[PDB]
Design an enzyme around this catalytic site. Structure first.
Site, PDB file in Angstrom:
ATOM      1  N   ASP A  52       0.851  -1.175   0.000  1.00  0.00           N
ATOM      2  CA  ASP A  52       0.000   0.000   0.000  1.00  0.00           C
ATOM      3  C   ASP A  52       0.898   1.239   0.000  1.00  0.00           C
ATOM      4  OD1 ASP A  52      -2.846   1.120   2.016  1.00  0.00           O
ATOM      5  OD2 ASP A  52      -1.421   2.262   0.822  1.00  0.00           O
ATOM      6  N   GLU A 131      25.399  17.980  11.050  1.00  0.00           N
ATOM      7  CA  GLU A 131      25.785  18.016  12.456  1.00  0.00           C
ATOM      8  C   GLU A 131      24.556  17.837  13.335  1.00  0.00           C
ATOM      9  OE1 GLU A 131      29.188  21.537  11.770  1.00  0.00           O
ATOM     10  OE2 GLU A 131      27.658  21.630  13.340  1.00  0.00           O
ATOM     11  N   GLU A 133      22.047  16.797  16.203  1.00  0.00           N
ATOM     12  CA  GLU A 133      22.053  16.740  17.663  1.00  0.00           C
ATOM     13  C   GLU A 133      20.784  16.107  18.237  1.00  0.00           C
ATOM     14  OE1 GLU A 133      22.759  20.735  18.601  1.00  0.00           O
ATOM     15  OE2 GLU A 133      24.788  20.708  17.736  1.00  0.00           O
ATOM     16  N   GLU A 188      26.829  18.188  23.760  1.00  0.00           N
ATOM     17  CA  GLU A 188      26.333  19.543  23.428  1.00  0.00           C
ATOM     18  C   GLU A 188      25.853  20.393  24.643  1.00  0.00           C
ATOM     19  OE1 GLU A 188      26.808  20.947  19.230  1.00  0.00           O
ATOM     20  OE2 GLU A 188      26.204  21.797  21.170  1.00  0.00           O
ATOM     21  N   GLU A 195      25.847  15.088  20.585  1.00  0.00           N
ATOM     22  CA  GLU A 195      26.012  15.256  19.135  1.00  0.00           C
ATOM     23  C   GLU A 195      27.058  14.285  18.547  1.00  0.00           C
ATOM     24  OE1 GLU A 195      28.031  18.570  16.050  1.00  0.00           O
ATOM     25  OE2 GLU A 195      26.706  19.325  17.609  1.00  0.00           O
ATOM     26  N   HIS A 244      22.901  21.374  11.759  1.00  0.00           N
ATOM     27  CA  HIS A 244      23.628  22.158  10.768  1.00  0.00           C
ATOM     28  C   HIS A 244      23.924  21.250   9.588  1.00  0.00           C
ATOM     29  CE1 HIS A 244      25.309  24.701  14.370  1.00  0.00           C
ATOM     30  NE2 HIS A 244      24.022  24.425  14.476  1.00  0.00           N
ATOM     31  N   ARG A 315      26.300  34.820  16.631  1.00  0.00           N
ATOM     32  CA  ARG A 315      25.514  34.130  17.684  1.00  0.00           C
ATOM     33  C   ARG A 315      24.341  33.289  17.129  1.00  0.00           C
ATOM     34  NH1 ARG A 315      20.254  33.631  19.394  1.00  0.00           N
ATOM     35  NH2 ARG A 315      20.019  35.734  18.522  1.00  0.00           N
ATOM     36  N   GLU A 332      27.648  26.546   5.457  1.00  0.00           N
ATOM     37  CA  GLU A 332      26.913  25.904   6.564  1.00  0.00           C
ATOM     38  C   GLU A 332      25.565  26.596   6.803  1.00  0.00           C
ATOM     39  OE1 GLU A 332      29.049  24.249  10.121  1.00  0.00           O
ATOM     40  OE2 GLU A 332      27.536  25.202  11.375  1.00  0.00           O
ATOM     41  N   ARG A 334      22.844  26.673   9.515  1.00  0.00           N
ATOM     42  CA  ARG A 334      22.761  26.301  10.931  1.00  0.00           C
ATOM     43  C   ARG A 334      21.341  26.223  11.516  1.00  0.00           C
ATOM     44  NH1 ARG A 334      23.981  29.724  13.951  1.00  0.00           N
ATOM     45  NH2 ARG A 334      24.401  28.504  15.843  1.00  0.00           N
TER      46      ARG A 334
HETATM   47  N1  ADP Z   1      33.019  18.532   0.129  1.00  0.00           N
HETATM   48  C1  ADP Z   1      32.293  18.719   1.256  1.00  0.00           C
HETATM   49  N2  ADP Z   1      30.958  18.946   1.177  1.00  0.00           N
HETATM   50  C2  ADP Z   1      30.211  19.125   2.281  1.00  0.00           C
HETATM   51  N3  ADP Z   1      30.716  19.100   3.532  1.00  0.00           N
HETATM   52  C3  ADP Z   1      32.039  18.888   3.757  1.00  0.00           C
HETATM   53  C4  ADP Z   1      32.936  18.678   2.606  1.00  0.00           C
HETATM   54  N4  ADP Z   1      34.181  18.490   3.126  1.00  0.00           N
HETATM   55  C5  ADP Z   1      34.083  18.577   4.485  1.00  0.00           C
HETATM   56  N5  ADP Z   1      32.801  18.814   4.849  1.00  0.00           N
HETATM   57  C6  ADP Z   1      32.237  18.971   6.212  1.00  0.00           C
HETATM   58  O1  ADP Z   1      32.774  20.129   6.855  1.00  0.00           O
HETATM   59  C7  ADP Z   1      32.818  19.912   8.277  1.00  0.00           C
HETATM   60  C8  ADP Z   1      34.026  20.626   8.931  1.00  0.00           C
HETATM   61  O2  ADP Z   1      35.078  19.721   9.307  1.00  0.00           O
HETATM   62  P1  ADP Z   1      36.656  19.974   8.986  1.00  0.00           P
HETATM   63  O3  ADP Z   1      37.485  19.296  10.067  1.00  0.00           O
HETATM   64  O4  ADP Z   1      36.902  21.446   8.696  1.00  0.00           O
HETATM   65  O5  ADP Z   1      36.702  19.168   7.560  1.00  0.00           O
HETATM   66  P2  ADP Z   1      37.948  18.548   6.707  1.00  0.00           P
HETATM   67  O6  ADP Z   1      38.887  17.990   7.765  1.00  0.00           O
HETATM   68  O7  ADP Z   1      37.289  17.497   5.832  1.00  0.00           O
HETATM   69  O8  ADP Z   1      38.508  19.702   5.904  1.00  0.00           O
HETATM   70  C9  ADP Z   1      32.716  18.391   8.490  1.00  0.00           C
HETATM   71  O9  ADP Z   1      31.586  18.053   9.317  1.00  0.00           O
HETATM   72  C10 ADP Z   1      32.504  17.770   7.116  1.00  0.00           C
HETATM   73  O10 ADP Z   1      31.387  16.865   7.151  1.00  0.00           O
HETATM   74  N1  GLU Z   2      20.299  25.020  18.472  1.00  0.00           N
HETATM   75  C1  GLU Z   2      21.688  24.948  17.991  1.00  0.00           C
HETATM   76  C2  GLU Z   2      22.131  23.477  17.794  1.00  0.00           C
HETATM   77  C3  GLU Z   2      23.633  23.273  17.494  1.00  0.00           C
HETATM   78  C4  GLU Z   2      24.546  23.475  18.709  1.00  0.00           C
HETATM   79  O1  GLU Z   2      24.119  23.148  19.854  1.00  0.00           O
HETATM   80  O2  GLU Z   2      25.688  23.969  18.489  1.00  0.00           O
HETATM   81  C5  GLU Z   2      21.955  25.800  16.718  1.00  0.00           C
HETATM   82  O3  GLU Z   2      21.217  25.738  15.729  1.00  0.00           O
HETATM   83  O4  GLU Z   2      22.916  26.582  16.643  1.00  0.00           O
HETATM   84 MG    MG Z   3      28.590  23.895  13.615  1.00  0.00          MG
HETATM   85 MG    MG Z   4      27.217  21.984  16.969  1.00  0.00          MG
END
Ligand code: ADP
Ligand code: GLU
Ligand code: MG
Ligand code: MG
Ligand code: ADP
Ligand code: GLU
Ligand code: GLU
Ligand code: MG
Ligand code: MG
Ligand code: MG
Lengths: 443, 443, 221
Positions: A52, A131, A133, A188, A195, A244, A315, A332, A334
């Site tokens: 279904d 990321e 949590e 966290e 996390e 994030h 922030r 990113e 967030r």
């Molecule tokens: N090509 C990519 N696309 C999306 N996210 C990425 C990529 N490379 C790394 N990241 C993310 O960025 C975050 C930051 O971690 P960091 O230690 O700066 O990464 P790295 O050691 O791979 O350069 C990580 O959670 C990772 O999942």
């Molecule tokens: N509520 C937080 C979750 C991530 C964290 O704890 O750093 C935020 O969006 O920034």
């Molecule tokens: Mg972060």
């Molecule tokens: Mg975080």
């Protein structure tokens, strides 16, 4: 490829796998599965296991409409938790109508198609590091969650003594046996909050890994007499759980966001990409933020993106391009939360960047300033529009926007709005405990 | 007059009145007051009783600003209830700035205006018949309100047995020996709910009477070990207490709506007064239904409107008009709940008449057919409009409306928004029991 | 074993789903599906159209066997994935004889009425008998109401081939007794013992004075 059709078959036999879970995903992001005994494996792989199909539209269900289940072989996985008779296996699947064709309402097939729109522009990958949590509560006698958090730890504390529970430590162990690529994992802000962070992966590849996470979490939690939950704001006064999303667009195997020859070290591709995530922001929050509770987390104060802005240090900087560069150059976002449907949330962000790049959009100034610090007028003096504040406000933003609606298209868009409109309404028509403590005497 | 200054002294002496209450009304209609012994009455009548007017902001008060209390001698009342030292008496007073000019942020001195704005348009009297509904709950051991309804009566039923409790009868007899012109009462739809309608009165005397209803009810209720409340929707899924307002404008002592020779039996003054009320209802909703909870009553099906339009009959119409003509020609507004400040409800309602009568606006089709029947694509396709669903909808909607914004006058307005914005913020930032139970497991 | 009580009670709890047990029927004739027909309308033979045509007639009548408990009818209340209306479709919300798209051998006619309370052996007796009586007499299947039926008013439904099923068990019986094809499907012995036992079951229930009956009447009256 990652698994031959013969590769699946052998593993089962020598692995005493005795039960198959054809899992997929209803609209709200809920983990769905129809299961079958190992003896019906052929029937599965030959893509002829029917069901279904209306289960995907969650509670808004009208008719019984039969539908097919096409297992992605690469998704195949076996859980370390054995029955008393046989191990169990899983298969993340795609949903097809009875006419061999994709079901449009399937969120899995709805991302495979926004990934294609991507290709229609040359890119080869769109990688995704989440990321995600969550919170861990204690279970009372019967087996219900209480509101007794598991531990009294805080931000990044060495926070549960190793000898003992360690649901976090023990999840991150079982995840690594299942062939996951965990980056790290800390404790966290709020007590009892945890996390775990993923290594990047192909969008749909990582979404498959965000369902598998949530599922292995809530299972091991239970195993430790606990209750894991992904509700955004389980409790007033405490933190809220975020997810994030580290994003990046590769082209021919090379990060297209990078450019060690441009302002800020960001390719002109990236600047554009960013550009569009802001335009649509208010208009795509209803998907990245599905539930009523999600907005009790987007109150300025607990580090949660209230403000549509793109910095590196803020922030609640809704957008944040972290330290690292080169391969790992990524935007990113967030403001997502664990409740967001991964498949959808992802389709809606892409369609955002895509229309962004596709129409070459002009990115605003990085509010390097702390945004939080000022009044709404001072915040209005620049491009600081706060987000929709109620599920209604967010759902109106969404509908009014056309590019987010082709991101989900007729079916998906149609059923989402309904389920959500009922959900809000349910919440508004309700009379809450607060309204009685706040009114029954005052008036 | 009603009481000369001589009579006032004649009565305090002879009736062993030992304690006085200089009663007034703050921005949220909470009954405020200042308690002086009888040995200090003279100072009062001379208009020299100082007090902290920041209290008229209620909870948004900031700095302690000095204000004067000028009594309305006509409002002189003595409650049967005597501390064993002597009796108690009261005065509804106008808050007067210290320089002697009327304080414009005071709710009673702000309708006294819109009546002079009516006086300054030809009319002599703006009359009012209020239909105030209130619930009765049992006070527990500790003297706490419980959600126990004092009886399980029902619509127009013979409410609590005569010999037994019957607290509603009592409330009526105490109001008979206080010079209250009450018409008739009954038991309301829900269990323990009650209604008590008075004869009509000039906007000000009727409110004065309103406010004083609420006090004697709450008070006669505690006497019988109960808690009476005027909360629009105390309980989810049962009736909500709303307070209708039967408005009629006189012009030279006779009804200006009547017309035995115009269509429907209403003048062009009537058609116009309705015509104005339709325009701004959506906009004066944030004042007739001031609580977050108010909108937990404006949910279809509970004898409470949602739709802006007038009728002859109709289920829960917004401006139903009673067949009765003559002086008893009048336009009932069924929207208001007992939570609204009596003085501001009338301000805003008179202003959406005077604006309709002035601009000579024209009343749309009196939808005589049921409106709850028509689809959202069958209602709003005619003159039929939904009212705001959340309070924040009602405000954003109320701010943007020059005729109402001006009806209250800068002071009252902005303090109102603020206080109200504060009220919504509190509510949206709370994380209710519902939000967990719908999301703590599912997610 | 797992410290639980599994039950097959149609409607254990008021206001939540009820457990019903569908029955996908297909008649073979020489080892192949006798309903299929890749060249008749809808993809069903005249055997199929006829087997449906019979089932429609007597459903109202074989209800007192597919849903044998007083409680069974506390599940046949509109809105719970459970029928109330006698007619067939291709799709439909909670149809009584929906037919699955799938053909071939997998050609078949699902009867969504039955709940897990019915005796497996008698449910089938009566269902086969309302086919064989339809196939025999060559009866003809009414309009396969493909449009939603829960939508139409009582003055919009029963105005077509659309019939309500019995509401109370005693309705179902009086209705089941008066029906030669079902009465004969079970054969004198089984039948009369069935009525009795069942009449006993209803009598017990009607003569009870439930908690509801007090709470709706102990004060109001
Ligand atoms: N090509 C990519 N696309 C999306 N996210 C990425 C990529 N490379 C790394 N990241 C993310 O960025 C975050 C930051 O971690 P960091 O230690 O700066 O990464 P790295 O050691 O791979 O350069 C990580 O959670 C990772 O999942
Ligand atoms: N509520 C937080 C979750 C991530 C964290 O704890 O750093 C935020 O969006 O920034
Ligand atoms: Mg972060
Ligand atoms: Mg975080
Ligand atoms: N002239 C008037 N103008 C405004 N309201 C009135 C007038 N006369 C009565 N009312 C109010 O209208 C309500 C409806 O009562 P109803 O029985 O229709 O009045 P009547 O019997 O006087 O026609 C009463 O609660 C009363 O307070
Ligand atoms: N209290 C209801 C009306 C019901 C009645 O008075 O019977 C309302 O106006 O919301
Ligand atoms: N158990 C339901 C059907 C619901 C379902 O199987 O999802 C019935 O036939 O009454
Ligand atoms: Mg009434
Ligand atoms: Mg009335
Ligand atoms: Mg079925």
């Amino acid at each position: 490829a990652k698994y031959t059709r013969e590769d699946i078959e052998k593993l089962v036999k020598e692995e005493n796998v005795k039960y198959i879970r054809l899992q997929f995903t209803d609209i709200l992001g809920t983990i769905k599965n129809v299961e079958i005994p190992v003896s019906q494996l052929g029937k599965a792989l030959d893509n002829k296991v029917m069901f279904d199909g209306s289960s995907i539209e969650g509670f808004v269900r009208i008719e019984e409409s039969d539908m097919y289940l096409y297992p992605d072989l690469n998704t195949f996985v076996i859980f370390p938790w054995t029955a008393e008779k046989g191990k169990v296996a899983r298969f993340i699947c795609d949903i097809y109508n009875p006419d061999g064709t994709p079901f449009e309402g399937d969120p899995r097939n709805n991302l495979k198609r926004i990934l294609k729109e991507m290709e229609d522009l040359g890119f080869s990958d769109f990688n995704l590091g989440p990321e995600p949590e969550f919170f861990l509560f204690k279970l009372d006698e019967k087996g219900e969650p209480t509101l007794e958090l598991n531990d009294k730890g805080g931000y990044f504390d060495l926070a549960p003594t190793d000898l003992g529970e360690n649901c976090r430590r023990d999840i991150v162990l079982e995840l690594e046996e299942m062939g996951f690529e965990i980056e790290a994992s800390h404790h966290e802000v709020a007590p009892g909050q945890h996390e775990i962070d993923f290594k990047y992966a192909g969008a749909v590849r990582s979404c498959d890994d965000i369902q598998t996470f949530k599922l292995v979490v809530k299972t091991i939690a239970r195993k430790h007499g606990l209750h894991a939950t992904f509700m955004p704001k389980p409790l007033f006064g405490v933190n809220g759980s975020g997810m994030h999303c580290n994003l990046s667009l590769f082209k021919n195997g090379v990060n297209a966001f990078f450019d060690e020859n441009a302002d800020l070290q960001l390719s002109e591709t990236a600047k554009h990409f960013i550009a569009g995530i802001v335009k649509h922001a208010t208009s795509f929050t209803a998907v990245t933020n599905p539930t009523v509770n999600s907005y009790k987390r987007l109150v300025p104060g607990y580090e949660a993106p209230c403000y549509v802005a793109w910095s590196a240090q803020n922030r609640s900087p809704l957008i944040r391009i972290p330290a690292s560069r080169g391969i790992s150059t990524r935007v990113e976002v967030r403001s997502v939360d664990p409740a967001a449907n991964p498949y959808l949330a992802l389709s809606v962000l892409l369609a955002a960047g895509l229309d962004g790049i596709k129409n070459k959009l002009e990115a605003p100034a990085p509010i390097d300033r702390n945004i939080y610090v000022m009044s709404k007028e001072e915040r209005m003096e620049n491009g600081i529009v706060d987000l929709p504040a109620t599920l209604a406000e967010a759902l109106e933003e969404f509908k009014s926007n056309e590019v987010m609606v082709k991101a989900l298209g007729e079916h998906l868009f149609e059923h989402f709005i309904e389920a959500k409109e009922i959900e809000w309404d349910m919440f508004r028509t309700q009379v809450h405990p607060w309204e009685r403590e706040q009114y029954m005497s005052q008036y």
